[PDB]
């Protein structure tokens, strides 16, 4: 069934003094499609989606700094750090116009970049994306107590850094179907050493929940306001019950956002790519054929 391999030849580019790894496949010409993963994944999360798009479009899938095969500088790994590295990655590859395919923290990066570079975005496909979570009641009940505990320097660092709970617990709890041992080993590989787990803990502490942190909430509100008035073509994938995006929120956005098509992938939590990669990939390819790219 769902592929477990990661066949892609490694590419690296140096930005801000550090190497970022990326997948780069597909034809060399045309408008490239840039795939941005989130927490606690890597370009591995796109492995079964890219092959539907790569016949006809260049596919670029970087690993965020400190994640995947990318370098591990001694950083706080705040969202702001990821913004600087991704801004530099995009420019270092000489990308001009792009289509974005974005998920989780990759979607905050993608939307924030699109807001600041709107002339260069030809379309955005997005799923299980960062939006303001106004209260803890709007976080899924099944995941509420653990995410509240993650957002502390005592229990949260014990769980995420020392016990590897984000990889061993939260990740499988973000996929409806069972992950195999081989898939788990691909997700574990960047984080075998606890000293390398800072991004896994800082990311949930950056999530915009109940107004906190104020700076992230403001930045996310700004890109959501931009998205609501942007003519950019939009493709929204969602599942039931979801995690960041409940079905009601997907339906609300499908109506409120200009030029937006929405696609139900079936059962899904956070890593929709792991529950229905073939629908996501095939639908991205079909939608791309309708764009002026
Ligand atoms: Cl997170």
Which CATH number characterizes residue 218's domain?
3.40.50.1820
Distance 175 CA to ligand 1 centre (A): 15
CA dihedral 218, 213, 274, 97 (to 10 degrees): 30
Distance 84 CA to ligand 1 centre (A): 18
Distance 110 CA to ligand 1 centre (A): 16
**E strands within the chain?**
11-15, 18-25, 33-36, 59-62, 98-104, 121-129, 234-241, 260-268
In the sheet that 260-268 helps form, which strands lie side by side, from edge to edge?
A: 11-15, 18-25, 59-62, 33-36, 98-104, 121-129, 234-241, 260-268
Rg (CA), the chain: 17
Q: Which pair of structure tokens corresponds to residue 207?
A: 């999530």
Distance 30 CA to ligand 1 centre (A): 33
Distance 290 CA to ligand 1 centre (A): 33
DSSP-derived pairing of the beta strands 234-241 and 260-268: parallel
Distance 107 CA to ligand 1 centre (A): 12
Distance 87 CA to ligand 1 centre (A): 20
Distance 42 CA to ligand 1 centre (A): 13
Distance 115 CA to ligand 1 centre (A): 22
Distance 97 CA to ligand 1 centre (A): 28
Q: Which pair of structure tokens corresponds to residue 43?
A: 């370009």
Q: Are 149 and 160 in contact (CB under 8 A)?
A: no
DSSP-derived pairing of the beta strands 18-25 and 33-36: unpaired
Distance 199 CA to ligand 1 centre (A): 9
Distance 230 CA to ligand 1 centre (A): 26
Q: Which pair of structure tokens corresponds to residue 157?
A: 């660092």
In 209-265, alpha helices (H):
214-228, 247-256
**Entry resolution (Å):** 1.4
The DSSP letter of residue 54 is: T
In 3D, which of 126, 129, 130, 120 has the Cα closest to residue 49? Answer: 126
Distance 187 CA to ligand 1 centre (A): 15
Distance 293 CA to ligand 1 centre (A): 32
Distance 39 CA to ligand 1 centre (A): 5
CA dihedral 279, 120, 96, 288 (to 10 degrees): 20
Q: Is 260 part of a structural domain of the chain?
A: yes
Distance 150 CA to ligand 1 centre (A): 9
Longest dimension (CA), the chain: 51
Q: Is 175 part of a structural domain of the chain?
A: yes
Strand partners, 129: 104
Three-state DSSP state, 60 = strand
Q: Is 1 part of a structural domain of the chain?
A: no
In 3D, which of 189, 200, 188 has the Cα closest to residue 158? Answer: 200
Distance 264 CA to ligand 1 centre (A): 23
CA dihedral 126, 128, 131, 133 (to 10 degrees): 170
Q: Is 135 part of a structural domain of the chain?
A: yes
Asked, as a colleague might, if the bond just before 79 is cis with ω within 30 of 0, I would say no
Angle at 276 between CA 122 and CA 293, to 5 degrees: 15
CA dihedral 281, 176, 174, 106 (to 10 degrees): 10
Q: Which pair of structure tokens corresponds to residue 264?
A: 């139900």
Q: How many domains does the chain have?
A: 1
Q: Is 116 part of a structural domain of the chain?
A: yes
From the number of C-beta atoms within 10 Å of its C-beta (0-12, 13-18, 19+), residue 256 rates as exposed
> In whole angstroms, what is the distance from residue 108 CA to residue 67 CA?
16
Distance 207 CA to ligand 1 centre (A): 6
Q: Is 255 part of a structural domain of the chain?
A: yes
Q: Is 72 part of a structural domain of the chain?
A: yes
Which residues span the domain enclosing 140?
11-290
């Amino acid at each position: 069934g769902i592929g477990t391999g990661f066949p892609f030849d490694p590419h690296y580019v140096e930005v801000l003094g550090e190497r970022m790894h990326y997948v780069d496949v597909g034809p060399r010409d045309g408008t490239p499609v840039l795939f941005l993963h989130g927490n606690p994944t890597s370009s591995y999360v796109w492995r079964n989606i890219i092959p539907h798009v790569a016949p006809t479009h260049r596919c670029i899938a970087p690993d965020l700094i400190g994640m995947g095969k990318s370098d591990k500088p001694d950083l706080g790994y705040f969202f702001d750090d990821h913004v600087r590295f991704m801004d530099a990655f995009i420019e270092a590859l000489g990308l001009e116009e792009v289509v974005l395919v974005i998920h989780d923290w990759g979607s905050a990066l993608g939307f924030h970049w699109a807001k600041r570079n709107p002339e260069r975005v030809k379309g955005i496909a997005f799923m299980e994306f960062i939006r303001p979570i106004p209260t803890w009641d709007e976080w899924p009940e099944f995941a509420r107590e653990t995410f509240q505990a993650f957002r502390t320097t005592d229990v949260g660092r014990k769980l995420i850094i020392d016990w590897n709970v984000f990889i061993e617990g939260t990740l499988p709890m973000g996929v409806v179907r069972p992950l195999t041992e081989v898939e788990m080993d691909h997700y574990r590989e960047p984080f075998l050493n606890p000293v390398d787990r800072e991004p896994l803990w800082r990311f949930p502490n950056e999530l915009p929940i109940a107004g906190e942190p104020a700076n992230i909430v403001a930045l996310v509100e700004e890109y959501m306001d931009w998205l609501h008035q942007s003519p950019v073509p939009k493709l929204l994938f969602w599942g039931t019950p979801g995690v960041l995006i409940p079905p009601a929120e997907a339906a609300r956005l499908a109506k409120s956002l200009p030029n937006c098509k929405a696609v139900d992938i079936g059962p899904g939590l956070n890593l929709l790519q792991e529950d229905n990669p073939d629908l996501i990939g095939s639908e991205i390819a079909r939608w791309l054929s309708t764009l002026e790219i």
